């Protein structure tokens, strides 16, 4: 069990109908609040750990938006060292319906240190996710 990682929130700007459910809702510790993106497709969110910081990721936890759990199926989590994710590797792919109102935990087995991590949502999802957490350790 490694510590929860912190960083600068990055990702799709804005929110559905300008209501205010931005990417920041996925990092607030409340499983009742969620990111609702401004478009059906293309939405993503994640962390920049900072210039010169690289973490090895050992675990990811996520909670779907209540009532919209199907919108996570096919979503993937990536690590990268470029902010445009052109060097990204997939750390986990969501293949079954995540349980409602809880954090699903998945192990990651990849020794690479990453400056950036993200959740990349599937078409038709508006990026819907309630909470997103990364765990791991500074790269040696």
Ligand X SMILES: OC[C@H]1O[C@@H](O[C@H]2[C@@H](OC[C@H]3O[C@@H](O[C@H]4[C@H](O)[C@@H](O)[C@H](O)O[C@@H]4CO)[C@H](O)[C@@H](O)[C@@H]3O[C@@H]3O[C@H](CO)[C@@H](O)[C@H](O)[C@H]3O)OC[C@@H](O)[C@@H]2O)[C@H](O)[C@@H](O)[C@H]1O
Give the burial string for 29-58 (b: 16+ CB within 10 Å, else e): eebebbbbbbeeeebbbbbebeeeebbbbb
Site string for Ca ion, 76-115 (x = CB under 5 A): ----------------------------------------
CA end-to-end distance (rounded Å), the chain? 17
Cα–Cα distance, 9 to 24 (Å, whole number): 7
Of 9, 14, 33, 48, the residue at the interface with Ca ion (CB under 5 A) is 33
Instruction: State the binding partner of 65 from ligand X, Ca ion, none, CB within 5 to 8 A by kind.
Output: none
Instruction: State the binding partner of 71 from Ca ion, ligand X, none, CB within 5 to 8 A by kind.
Output: ligand X
Instruction: Give least dist CB 81 to ligand X, A.
Output: 31
Instruction: State the binding partner of 36 from Ca ion, ligand X, none, CB within 5 to 8 A by kind.
Output: ligand X
Note the maximum CA span of the chain: 44
């Amino acid at each position: 069990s490694y510590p929860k990682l912190t960083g600068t929130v990055i990702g799709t700007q804005g929110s559905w109908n300008n209501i205010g459910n931005t990417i920041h809702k996925a990092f607030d510790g409340d499983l009742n609040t969620f990111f609702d993106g401004p478009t059906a497709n293309g939405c993503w969110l994640g962390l920049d750990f900072g210039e010169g910081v690289r973490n090895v990721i050992t675990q990811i936890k996520f909670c779907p938006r209540s009532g919209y759990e199907q919108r996570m199926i096919g979503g993937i989590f990536q690590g990268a060292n470029k902010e445009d994710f052109s060097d990204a590797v997939t750390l986990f792919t969501i293949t079954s319906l995540p349980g409602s109102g809880t954090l699903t935990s998945v192990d990651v087995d990849n020794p690479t240190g990453f400056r950036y991590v993200r959740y990349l949502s599937p078409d038709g999802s508006n990026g819907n996710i309630a909470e997103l957490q990364f765990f791991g350790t500074p790269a040696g």
